[PDB]
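Quick question: what would this complex look like in 3D?
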Amino acid sequence: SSWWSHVEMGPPDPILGVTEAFKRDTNSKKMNLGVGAYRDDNGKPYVLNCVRKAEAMIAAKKMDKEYLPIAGLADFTRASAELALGENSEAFKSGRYVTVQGISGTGSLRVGANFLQRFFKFSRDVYLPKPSWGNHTPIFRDAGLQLQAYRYYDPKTCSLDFTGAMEDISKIPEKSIILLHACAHNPTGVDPRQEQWKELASVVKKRNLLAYFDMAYQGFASGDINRDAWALRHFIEQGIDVVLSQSYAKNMGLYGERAGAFTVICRDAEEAKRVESQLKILIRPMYSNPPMNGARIASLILNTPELRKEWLVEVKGMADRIISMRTQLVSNLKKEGSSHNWQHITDQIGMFCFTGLKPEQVERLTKEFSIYMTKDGRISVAGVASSNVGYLAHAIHQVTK
Amino acid sequence: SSWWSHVEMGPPDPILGVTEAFKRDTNSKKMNLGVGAYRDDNGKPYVLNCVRKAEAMIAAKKMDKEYLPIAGLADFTRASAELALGENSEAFKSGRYVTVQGISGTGSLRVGANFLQRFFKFSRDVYLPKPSWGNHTPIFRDAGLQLQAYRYYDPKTCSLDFTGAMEDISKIPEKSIILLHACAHNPTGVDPRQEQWKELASVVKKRNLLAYFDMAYQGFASGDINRDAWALRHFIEQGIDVVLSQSYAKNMGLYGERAGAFTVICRDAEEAKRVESQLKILIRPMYSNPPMNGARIASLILNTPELRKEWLVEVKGMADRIISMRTQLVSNLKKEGSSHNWQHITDQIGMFCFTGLKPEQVERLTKEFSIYMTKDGRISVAGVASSNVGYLAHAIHQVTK
Ligand SMILES: *Cc1c(COP(=O)(O)O)cnc(C)c1O
Ligand SMILES: *Cc1c(COP(=O)(O)O)cnc(C)c1O
């Protein structure tokens, strides 16, 4: 009998553990549609070009490796707030925001969670949309908050349940926290139309809720970064002081680099200062300071007009591919004789597809064809290459027939 | 009013805050002897040659940026354990340990605290040496643990108070946590001798305390990495099953790249596997997975013989440097005419010198000479160059005369 005799075996991450499994699989035909990481046309990891170039400018600049400030690389911090809020943004232009660099979107979400935990004085309840990215839960629960939920996706409709979203939402108690995905709702793939966003926002405003936006796929909803930040900025423009999480993980394909940020909309520029100090005091004992290379790469591209332009064309290309994949997806599905409706594959947006597959359906795909995905029938459509759209289709069909 | 209208403006970090201040001083002659960050003889940031080399092989390797597993890069992982534990290590050879990559030393300390709080049931109190590094307090506190202390440094004599320490230690309640700095006690720069270390082991074994080692300067106290891990290793062979934190921040001079690790020694390999599960379960909702740049490098060096060799020679060279500065500093103080004994300057090991100066004196250094240090009068020795060594000397003379 010792120290850790009592600790039991925990399970494998529902998302992340798929990669694990994936890697152990000897079938050469294997695919990992678990997590959402973009592959190019040959099924390979794709490092954007502007990333490479920036990588190089850093190298050639022979920079040091001294510590970052707690809040991160200023230059990155600011570029992020602009990318998000928009250059013409009041809130932006008047200095009422604070943004600290974080450990990508997860770390960002968390300090955000912990900040709410420590200062938000009116409630410990956080309302998540049904369903929501799995990590949401543990991020908020480990932070000290309790979780609630508001209806969002209708499975018989394979579309948003706006009505229910609004009934639920309209009944959330005044001054509660509501997690809203900025765009590219993980895992549904469905987001509200402007008209509906416009609507939600009135109730948030109306019920005086703290709105927490998580923006991990800016650019991926449509391929247009500003058309994707519409919602967020709207809200803010109606007078809703939100909080936000951002990740350059997917859109810059800096996955393991860890680049994200957390921002808080304040009243003044004075409040902003005040809050930052606290943010910092939250962080020091967390990780001391952030990992620098990701932000360097990113800060360089955001702030270098050339780099920036190329980036944006690369992002558009990414989106485009995926789209082609959906399209190819369903057509082969028919080509294969599938009596089922597969329009969802084409109507949804972002990096996945919320297939509808049942967990048995799910297993069979892993087992028989080594196609790896999540228990919720959620597939990374972004990890499918041209050469494998066809196999996916067969498998799916085979599983679904 | 406002969500945050009550958020108070907090104070700058006791250590990390001097750098901020430092950056604002316009005197050409400033020196940042605050944080323990090494500079070459010209007072310039020193990126190790083996560091420079490893980055070159990664770029040349044209590697990807995909996510790393939760615990991190296995090679990095395996390596630090070894680095720490030793290769002839039994616990290492058997695989009774679990190492997870972390966000340098802090994030390691922090996950370790977070693990303790979750699973260590036999206590809620962590015993810190007096004094300890500043960050330790908040790390544990923020983590939900209770803080205690044992005597360590006697300031009257400016030496370790082995007696008190031992009194304090022997009466720690059974099965509590005691934090011990593996080497290079920060800020004291005063470590137990091998015979005291052998005493200490004896009682922790006896009271049957949980030993948390903080190991940040492996290689900087003695100039020899193996020599620096003697006690860690000592305790282990004595059957004390430890928890340990690593920083590659100083010794690999990888500061802002954030590389480090946390490791818990377990009874079996079986059990380690169970902890590892848990450990990962803790990290995901924290920052999902660690930054990858720093680990690639580190693992590249620790795992490539040439690289490892030169690193050892690089670290030893670093260590000798600081000994030169120490010495020079005192003899310069003599020549300037300082009435006092400045023996501790040469007695203390690691990057620093715990000078014994008073607040006023330090205030005077910053103000008049622009020399920046911690209000407890702890100077960064590793921060002085051949070229500014006199300045400091004169300063310290004028403020102390
Ligand atoms: C990817 C993602 C995030 C952030 O992930 P990181 O890799 O840590 O940047 C946050 N939310 C959702 C819904 C995501 O899909
Ligand atoms: C520097 C140091 C650490 C680790 O520093 P990081 O920047 O987090 O890597 C841990 N403990 C002590 C006592 C230190 O001096």
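Answer marked as accepted. The radius of gyration of chain B is 21 Å.
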